[model samples]
Target: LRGTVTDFPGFDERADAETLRKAMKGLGTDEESILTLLTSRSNAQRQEISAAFKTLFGRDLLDDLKSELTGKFQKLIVALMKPSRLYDAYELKHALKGAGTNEKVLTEIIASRTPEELRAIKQVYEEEYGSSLEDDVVGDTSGYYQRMLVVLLQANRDPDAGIDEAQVEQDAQALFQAGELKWGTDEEKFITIFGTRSVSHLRKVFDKYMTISGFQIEETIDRETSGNLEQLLLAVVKSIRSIPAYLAETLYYAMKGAGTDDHTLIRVMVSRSEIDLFNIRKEFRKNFATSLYSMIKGDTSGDYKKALLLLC
Candidate 1:
């Protein structure tokens, strides 16, 4: 529940706004220091920088940086500046613009992020944009992906700080009826319970489901469903059961086939570097018996490879 550590120097609150603004501007920007300061600091530290930049420069640090930086470098800077805020802004932009709608990005972002992260993103999104991420979820995406994402974004996905076995059983019954016993599976109900429930509570539900149904929830879903819907169902299960394994598999394939899915590689590495990259590395070693670093080195090249190696 606490903030994670960054690998570089903490942001210097003592620095003047002009100094910070200079750091944020130009091609000759102090990228390493910027990376360290932004990535390592806690959200509180980021908030301080944001406020200080505003007081010092009469401009939003983010707005100024957006004007100066471009492409992946821009993404990395903004991500370090404030991840949740960027995600909220990106979510709205992706939904409102573009030709066909980037549902894949929306689904992946909403589905895979932790509950604590979601809560922060939701609050920042609403406050900064004057619009709810929840409202965008309702307005933009529909059907199964929408159902899965909205539930995860609710911030109630994780339970209150305690466990209740009786409630777990009650939730398990609902899960069974939704995915297993019904004529057509109730995916909305499934996403609400599966994605929203706390990890502890969901663990309890899985245990209860195993005892009562004589099978794992994931096994039942795999046996019963087929196609992309099946993938979504299993994603929820894997994300709940062993997120690292789920992520590793997703990452491996992204870089595995005929051509590299560099976007996926960039997105996952940039986002997970602070939170779950170590876990994903461990999972990769356990699952493949080969190091994640080795796999990445073999698969990528140049700057892309360099950025990824920093995290691995």
Candidate 2:
């Protein structure tokens, strides 16, 4: 549950605020100083520093930083300073609002986050965008895909409530009949189970499902669903078992081949830095056979590179 980023010893939030203030005040901002200072503190610390900066200087810390910085460095810092839920709220909004929805953001976020976390984000989503996450998502997406999202978005996955072994077996057979046994799939069966069950509960179901279907649960999903449905279902399955592994794969694909996706990279880095990022870094090395730091160090440059290296 540890991230590479930790509390700075002998921390002084007001003093830290002044460091940030002075760094941004000059005609030429000191990007390295800015990056070095922000990357060391946890969000609690970062939040405090931003609060202190505004109270002491009468200047909004985020607005000042944006004025002084540009490109992905600006993008990176903006996410860094917000409470995770607020940032998550706004992040999902623009993804849903645009001409083309960023389904990856919508799905990964909806799938990976906890019920309590999503509960918070939806309120803030409404506050920030003057709309419901459910309505926005349903408006943008089609059919069962949106159903899957809306169900999850309702923050109903209380998967740790209890482990129902009998129901686990029943749900396992339900999936088998819905997919591996039948010709056409009953998408509702899959969506209902995935949406309502707890994480630990479905993990038990996945185990029973493999025994009943003679194939892994994911393999069945691959055969049964196509496109976004498959991805969303699999994201749920993966996150249920291990979100760090889910995120590790996500990070790899972002930097995989020819291009680096700062969108995905920054999201994971900013969001997970204080959560499971320690485990994510572990899974990245395990799955990819290359260090997370090594890939990030190679893919990014300038202050952006330095910031991620600190976060990683």
Candidate 3:
């Protein structure tokens, strides 16, 4: 997927840092100049610029940006400045830090990441927060919800594993018996198969399941489950199906309601921009019958809107 930002050809981090320092050092902050320099460069370039800003000006660039910029504009710049893995770690930490839980945030991060990506986030989480990601999940969540998350946190999905037809059929039968055929749902069975199988294998299982039951696995999940557990399972199916479409649906929901879900909005846009955002934009247009660009234009305003649109 293509990102809006790329390496500035013949780039000089120190020169860029100087330009940024000049923009923010004046009596009035040069917001346009700041946006141009910061948003156009890739995150790696931004990090270098940040370090140079401190080296040359003896002032931290992030703190300077935080002081000069306001609202979502500030958030945009800050999000741009951090490495993707560190940003994800921060998001997970933010979700888990407060009272109750941001199950949606947990679901988004945990459900979408690959095993390698998740391992990076886990490392960053422990280093930055001084607590294990697994421990926090255990402390905050209970029962099936906790189990599903812990399993996902293990990042055991074998992305490259060849699909097994017999295993797929067996898992299909297991899922059917666990949900539709049984009186009460056997969530553990659902979790085990969904959490452990390769994404390709699960797709086969979902297809086989539909053939056997005359219902989508998602329909079964919805019928048999409720609350956060239900959301988690559905996210798993969606992620396994098409992460771009899943994230596209997430962006639609974030902007669809009465008030914007800014946290989710920022997380999805910033995180995906450098990954599969090109596909996400296409998926958003395909799934929502509207462009994500138009949705952002309608739901948000000011530099915040501008920043998000640039990323989109």
Candidate 4:
């Protein structure tokens, strides 16, 4: 969660705005100047600069950036400009749009958010799209997948709840009976416990479930379930155990393939930059045996690479 761009002390938003305007003014865009100003400033600072740009020039800074920058560079800048909650809302809306649903994106956003974070995102989603996030999720998904999404969207988990050893044992036994010891999967048991339990409680539940079933909860979920529901359940388990590690793995998957999953790459980096990016970077190195900085440098280029590296 350590951001590279801290508030530049004694910062002047109007001066930064002037500099950005000059960079993008007539002739060719000053890519280096634009990069320097945007990448070096925190999101709050960027918002200030954005407002100043509009006030001084009577033009929207985001629109100006869109006109001046292209492709991944533009995407990175735009991602940096949005407030975190609005960025998440946009990402969620994008995932649900088009011909097919991006279940992975949906799962990532839904499972990774804390209750308060989810509530902010829900509010933004309704405001942005004039529709409920839950309704879109329900329309796009069905069965257990829909059920899981709805449960998560409720944002009712008590993150600070204390763990009970006896209850953990009971939940572990119940999970074993529902999945490993039974023919048909009793998904309700899995959904209820995974969705509602505190992270600390779930960590114990996972360990206890492992002892009772002789399989990791992830392995059990994979074996007992299919499709998006399996992925969602595993993501919940992973996030509960370690959100940083889960996000690190998510970033790894985004960049390891033939072409990058740019949406995932951009979303995770931008959203986590000021929150848990330092931990994510450490987890990325530990899990992949490669530095996130190096991977980003290799996978992306120009202003895009520079911007992400700054965040990393």
- Number of the candidate with higher lDDT, 2 or 4: 2
| Candidate 4: segments with Cα more than 4 A from true spot | 181-184, 223-226
**So what's the TM-score on candidate 1?**
0.68
On the 0 to 100 scale, the lDDT of residue 34 in model 1 is: 54
True-structure lDDT of candidate 1: 0.66
Compared with the true structure, model 3 gives a TM-score of 0.94
Model 2: which residue pairs collide? 159-198, 159-199
Q: For model 3, give the 10-residue run with minimal summed lDDT.
A: 179-188
lDDT of 2 at 272: 88
**Residues 32-132 of candidate 2: C-alpha lDDT, one tens digit per residue:** 88899999887889889988998898989989999999999999999898886688888898798879798889889999998888999999988988988
Candidate 3 lDDT tens digits, 1-312: 665456778789999999998888869888878876766777888888888888887898888889999887888788888886698889888888889988889988899888888999999899999999999989999988899999999988766477878888889898889767441477777788989888888989989989998988777667323578778888889999998989898889888869998878888888877788889989989888999999999999988887777777
Best by lDDT: 2
Local accuracy of candidate 4 as per-residue lDDT tens digits, 139-196: 8888988998999999997565667888889888887787664324788887888888
Note the clash tally of each candidate.
Answer: 1, 2, 0, 3
Clash count, candidate 4: 3
Error of 3 at 118 (Å): 1.0
> Model 4 reaches what TM-score against the true structure?
0.93
